[PDB]
Amino acid sequence: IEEGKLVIWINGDKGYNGLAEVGKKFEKDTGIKVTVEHPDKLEEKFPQVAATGDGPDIIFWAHDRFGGYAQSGLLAEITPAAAFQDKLYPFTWDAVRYNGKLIAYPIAVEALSLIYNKDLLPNPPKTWEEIPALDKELKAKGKSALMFNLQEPYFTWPLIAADGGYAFKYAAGKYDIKDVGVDNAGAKAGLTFLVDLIKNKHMNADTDYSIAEAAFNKGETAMTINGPWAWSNIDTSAVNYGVTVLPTFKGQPSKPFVGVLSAGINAASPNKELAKEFLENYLLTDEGLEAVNKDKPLGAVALKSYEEELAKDPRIAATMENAQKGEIMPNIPQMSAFWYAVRTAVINAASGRQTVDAALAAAQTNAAAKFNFTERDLTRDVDFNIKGDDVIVFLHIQKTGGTTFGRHLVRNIRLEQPCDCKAGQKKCTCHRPGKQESWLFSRFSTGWSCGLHADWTELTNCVPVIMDRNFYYITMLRDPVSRYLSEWKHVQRGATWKTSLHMCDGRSPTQDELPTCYNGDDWSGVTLHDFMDCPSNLANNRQVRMLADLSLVGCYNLSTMNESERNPILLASAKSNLKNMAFYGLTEFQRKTQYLFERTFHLRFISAFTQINSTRAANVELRDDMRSRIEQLNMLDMQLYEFAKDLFLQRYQFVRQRERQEERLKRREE
Ligand SMILES: O=C(O)[C@H]1O[C@@H](Oc2ccc([N+](=O)[O-])cc2)[C@H](O)[C@@H](O)[C@@H]1O[C@H]1O[C@H](CO)[C@@H](O[C@@H]2O[C@@H](C(=O)O)[C@@H](O[C@H]3O[C@H](CO)[C@@H](O[C@@H]4O[C@H](C(=O)O)[C@@H](O[C@H]5O[C@H](CO)[C@@H](O)[C@H](O)[C@H]5NS(=O)(=O)O)[C@H](O)[C@H]4O)[C@H](O)[C@H]3NS(=O)(=O)O)[C@H](O)[C@H]2OS(=O)(=O)O)[C@H](O)[C@H]1NS(=O)(=O)O
Ligand SMILES: OC[C@H]1O[C@H](O[C@H]2[C@H](O)[C@@H](O)[C@@H](O[C@H]3[C@H](O)[C@@H](O)[C@@H](O[C@H]4[C@H](O)[C@@H](O)[C@@H](O)O[C@@H]4CO)O[C@@H]3CO)O[C@@H]2CO)[C@H](O)[C@@H](O)[C@@H]1O
Ligand SMILES: Nc1ncnc2c1ncn2[C@@H]1O[C@H](COP(=O)(O)O)[C@@H](OP(=O)(O)O)[C@H]1O
Ligand SMILES: [Cl-]
Ligand SMILES: [Cl-]
Ligand SMILES: [Cl-]
Ligand code: NA
Ligand code: NA
Ligand code: NA
Ligand code: NA
């Protein structure tokens, strides 16, 4: 981001040419250039890049995305004088308040309306229920009743919400993120109605924004559902159209989710005062908003003065009627998870590939961020025969507390013949009774015989050969921000693990495949910024990479597939390999780790594990924006760890409960 310039991101359906005109007036008056851009998926890109030092100075989107950005420390708190605040409606400032603080400037209120072609349909239907009859009439005339975007849940939500669907329950002054309303009876009735429209061929599951718009603007369909921004192209096509209240469902109004177009200032912007000037003194004026509105209409604008001027527009009147009947969107971080969940459910139900009930049940789980596991997933019972052919393999991922855990395995297990650890010696002899055979494959027993910090791909391909059986793989995991910081501090004091083989498909990577991040013998002294800056840093997503089958993505050769393909493959593979291990622990839960290891393998430790809170990672003072960048660099690991933590804690609860029941049944004999 350059100082002395402004870069603005706004969505491609908004009046970006008009906004650019406002930017040119600002430049005329100040010599400060303003660049407007409309990148694809800007709302996903922003948290990915703002966290570094790219990204725009100002980001426009509906307010629902901004709580998540604010929680990650990506937005500047905005500081409008009371005089300026009174220029906009309080309704709209509420939309942009997060945890007591204002995090953007409200621009305009948007709600979906029913848009109809007066030359085909001079009185639009008041109910969804009458649409099938109407369509049958229109099809006899070579036309259809209704087409609108079925791919984005924003457009189908009004119907799903009408009879009772909700996102998050509002209770006791906040949104309850555990009380999700996507699979209740009302939600199902709404979605069932839409699925039925499609089954009876009144609508097509494939219809998206473009297809619906093209059909309406060409007079092929009598109605569409869309926002104020859409009116411009309709006027361009010279359709004679009206904008009205959405139809009712089961006698109740359609309830669109209401958005407030909002302008946030990037926390990493060196231009915060200039951004403030532009927004307050150029855009949020009658003239600024008029310039944007003339390009693509904004809806009901937040600035009282200009909102009064346009209030008489019946299109805006209908927009206000639908907005009053709907609900303002929450701005909480969990909104994007809600939307992603509903997006998928609606597509799969609409296609007929999944029933409404199953699809919404899946959305419910996802929106509430829950994990369902089978009994088999929770039950890990290993008749561990040290006398037999069983071998425990400890896959040690760097900085997960593996030195501690590995020392526990060789020093701390009560065995008839425990490991023989001679004083002042690194390794131990962990042999079966009476034999010269090892029961533990690990750094402190066999050594790094399949390579330094051999990962899942290496171990599974090397261990069986180098020991000739039942192999019981185990590992430890750590929250990724802490694990990443720990690795940065260890590298900063000389760690490189440069002798690791990184073997996959029978060879090590080439330098082109895996470039080194440092010149010279090591990366000692590196700052966190420079650590984060190397694209090929093996610290990034280390736990996923080391638990996945790397052959599935072409090993270390990043040209063999795109990131959009490679990433889901890695995550799924790591989840599967982890889940299917005999056991794993979490660094943050030392005692639960001990207990589950003991109950999995039917072993006991001599001395209790202990929790060390005062780690080197814990001592790093971490800005929220920086934490967020570390999360983004480790996003696969963040997902793996969320999964792993939940499974681990569900395993703990399951095993403890069972043990408590057993004790009790025993007492209920005596
Ligand atoms: O045996 C020979 O061939 C011998 O021959 C001699 O010549 C003759 C001998 C005899 C006769 N005769 O007539 O009788 C004639 C001639 C010749 O002079 C020798 O050069 C030659 O020796 C060669 O072979 C021997 C046997 O293989 C080698 O000795 C082995 O290896 C040594 C070594 O590699 O240094 C040494 O191993 C011990 O020390 C290592 C280094 O510390 C240990 O490995 C390290 O483990 C670290 C760890 O786990 O902590 C790891 O650290 C990294 O990860 C951790 C955890 O994440 C981080 O904390 C660290 O920060 C991180 N550091 S990093 O970022 O820098 O990576 C390290 O990476 C890893 O290197 C090793 O575990 C330890 N083994 S031990 O405990 O068992 O002792 C030993 O002497 C020996 O090991 S072993 O074979 O017994 O297992 C010798 O090196 C080799 N010399 S060479 O010149 O040919 O290469
Ligand atoms: O990978 C699947 C898709 O993911 C991406 O879309 C996501 C967004 O990132 C989420 O934020 C959300 O989108 C919401 C949006 O936040 C909300 O404001 C509303 O968007 C309206 C907008 O208010 C209005 O101004 C106008 O622009 O129409 C928008 C709807 O098209 O509703 C959205 C949900 O429909 O969820 C979506 C996933 O549905 C990514 O951008 C996609 O390209 C990708 O396919
Ligand atoms: N019992 C324990 N409780 C909490 N953290 C522990 C621990 N034993 C080790 N760790 C942490 O695990 C990291 C070392 O992992 P490894 O042995 O795999 O290199 C260190 O993190 P820090 O570097 O942040 O201090 C260390 O503090
Ligand atoms: Cl070794
Ligand atoms: Cl614990
Ligand atoms: Cl037990
Ligand atoms: Na040795
Ligand atoms: Na260490
Ligand atoms: Na160096
Ligand atoms: Na800290």
Side-chain angles (χ1 to χ4, degrees), residues 151-173:
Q151 308 308 306
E152 283 290 338
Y154 181 73
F155 291 82
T156 47
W157 189 252
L159 175 58
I160 294 168
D163 190 41
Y166 61 92
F168 297 105
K169 177 61 64 150
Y170 196 82

Side-chain angles (χ1 to χ4, degrees), residues 54 206 213 241 253 303 364 368 416 490 496 563 567 570 578 588 624:
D54 285 83
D206 294 328
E213 177 182 53
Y241 70 101
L303 188 78
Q364 177 73 27
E416 281 197 317
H490 200 176
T496 67
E563 174 158 15
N567 283 351
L570 289 174
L578 182 69
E588 75 176 299
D624 286 337

